[PDB]
Symmetry: C3
Subunit: 152 residues, 3 copies
């Protein structure tokens, strides 16, 4: 079906964007680079899961992401408004990765609502967007960059 | 719910609604512009300020797209009506750059320095957003000025790409048949 | 002024004079093609040094993608409704792409594994180009199922994805980056 190819291509697109983003880390040894590579592998797993009456998609990564998300929010100031995308090359590419990921979630949702894919796949992509947002904020913080908010 | 989410007026729709594709593509555009902006190394450039104003305006179109006219109460009025001011700004800025650029006579390929390339990418993403917003406008659900703004933003990003290539002294590649 | 405002109400022109809404399948394939070309254009500027052959090949693909856009914007049905010519797409670029694919393929270690997009900035950037190129192919195949666009256009997008993948492996190899596996 053409819906499935669209889901798999958009998940591929997400993974490739994360790959480019990762190439933006200058110093090695950053734990979130390890996390982004684990996410790339999980993304290959959701791409396999989408091609099938639907295959079982392990719920493990969902908890992993949630744990990482709590880890980074614990170090961040409370955010209460919309931020403009910025805050270092890493943070910007991660916000682009975030938006691409939400496009992927929209491409997967019809398949889940039709019974052709495990709901855990959409749940994983939904939480992956929140992880991408919180991580962008954390990278901007660790570089000492503004985090510009607009309101009016 | 999972698979579902809400509009600013309280309508709960499945995550693949026209409005969610619209606001998400508006988000993708704002973020592409964000990376492009992180590519200006030298500070004080006025077009950095312009791209940031555009990011704000885009957050405003995001609110407009998330408030359908068919469900907009009175309190929501200030979001359904999208004043045309930002559009005029774009027109003015384009005129500003056009007086500084050589006359354009051929098809340009995306090129001309990292900023210029990033802006051509942003333009393509902008036109995708325009395609995702037009269905809402032609249905009566979002102010036409939003599509008008995105349509002019495509031309702004194009002339800005050209200006950046000029100021870096990089020469755009021209389309060549065969 | 360079803008006309004839698009301000959501409508636009194909190359046959027809006026369709901006969300039409032809405009979706033309835009996705436009986008792929711009992504290749940005990748083209991660080349550190001068005079790479694959940079010339990419700029050429860009030209060919302009020609793809032109073709896609000329739907065959409106071509016989408007008494226009046939608007063909030649096979030259596909055969060329296949040649370049062979040239790189023959130089890199075989691969049995699924690789993660990575391998340096050029490599990862070309993998992004590859995903976008596939999206273009997916936007074009409905147009050929309906008989509006020559099927060579789809085939060329499909061998362009193969070209970009093998070029990313080739860039990763020449850099000494190793593509990550899992
Ligand atoms: C879904 C799918 C995709 C999805 C998602 C895959 C993912 N998990 O990330 C997307 C769109 C991302 C994709 C991309 C690609 N894929 Co694909 N894909 C498939 C498909 C349908 C199943 C893959 C899968 O998930 N299997 C289950 C998981 C668990 O597989 P796996 O056990 O780990 O092992 C696989 C690989 O080792 C591969 N393998 C086996 N023999 C060979 C030989 C060669 C030369 C290669 C390269 C790989 C390979 O096949 C195994 C089974 O799928 C297969 C077709 C099939 N085999 O039925 C093609 C297939 C594996 N893909 C293929 C290709 C060509 C590619 C791309 C290079 C295409 C491109 N231009 O983008 C890229 C690879 C880049 C990358 N690594 O990201 C070819 C590989 C053979 C070849 N001619 O090179 C296959 C066999 C399709 C075909 N019939 O030609 N793909
Ligand atoms: C449409 C929409 C979007 C659109 C864009 C809207 C825009 N203008 O840019 C898109 C899809 C881009 C989006 C993205 C995000 N959003 Co949103 N979005 C909404 C929605 C449905 C309406 C927003 C709106 O335009 N309101 C009107 C404008 C004028 O309000 P405003 O005065 O400027 O004030 C708003 C902000 O202060 C916001 N706010 C309150 N708490 C928080 C917390 C955070 C972290 C943020 C970013 C904002 C925020 O709430 C106010 C009213 O909406 C609201 C839900 C709702 N309000 O019913 C969710 C909502 C604001 N979004 C939310 C989230 C989580 C996000 C994302 C982080 C999602 C993600 N993981 O990527 C990003 C943030 C992007 C950014 N800041 O750059 C949460 C925020 C609260 C929370 N739980 O943390 C909400 C409340 C939805 C929810 N129940 O989870 N969003
Ligand atoms: N948002 C878009 N996405 C994809 N293709 C488009 C889009 N808008 C226009 N097109 C196609 O590309 C061509 C150039 O678009 P262009 O923006 O120059 O004109 P327009 O938007 O129709 O009118 P205006 O001059 O008011 O912008 C059009 O003739 C049409 O083929
Ligand atoms: C923050 C707001 O974004 C919207 N929203 C929820 N999920 C997605 C998605 N995957 N893509 C785009 N927009 C989404 C909802 O309106 C939510 O309230
Ligand atoms: C690697 C797998 O990708 C699938 N495939 C082929 N073309 C596309 C495309 N444009 N987008 C997404 N998936 C595609 C094939 O079915 C193949 O098995
Ligand atoms: Mg236009
Ligand atoms: Mg024009």
């Amino acid at each position: 079906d053409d819906q499935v190819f669209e889901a798999v291509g958009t998940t591929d697109e997400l993974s490739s964007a994360i790959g480019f983003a990762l190439e933006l880390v200058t110093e090695k040894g950053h734990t979130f680079a390890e996390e982004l590579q684990k996410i790339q592998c999980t993304l290959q797993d959701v791409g396999s899961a989408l091609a099938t009456k639907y295959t079982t998609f392990k719920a493990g990564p969902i908890l992993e992401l949630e744990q990482w998300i709590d880890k980074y929010t614990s170090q961040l100031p409370p955010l209460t408004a919309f931020i403009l995308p910025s805050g270092g090359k890493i943070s910007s590419a991660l916000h682009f990765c975030r938006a691409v990921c939400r496009r992927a979630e929209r491409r997967v949702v019809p398949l889940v609502q039709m019974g052709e894919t495990d709901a855990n796949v959409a749940k994983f992509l939904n939480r992956l967007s929140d992880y991408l947002f919180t991580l962008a904020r954390y990278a901007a913080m660790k570089e000492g960059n503004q985090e510009k908010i607009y309101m009016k």
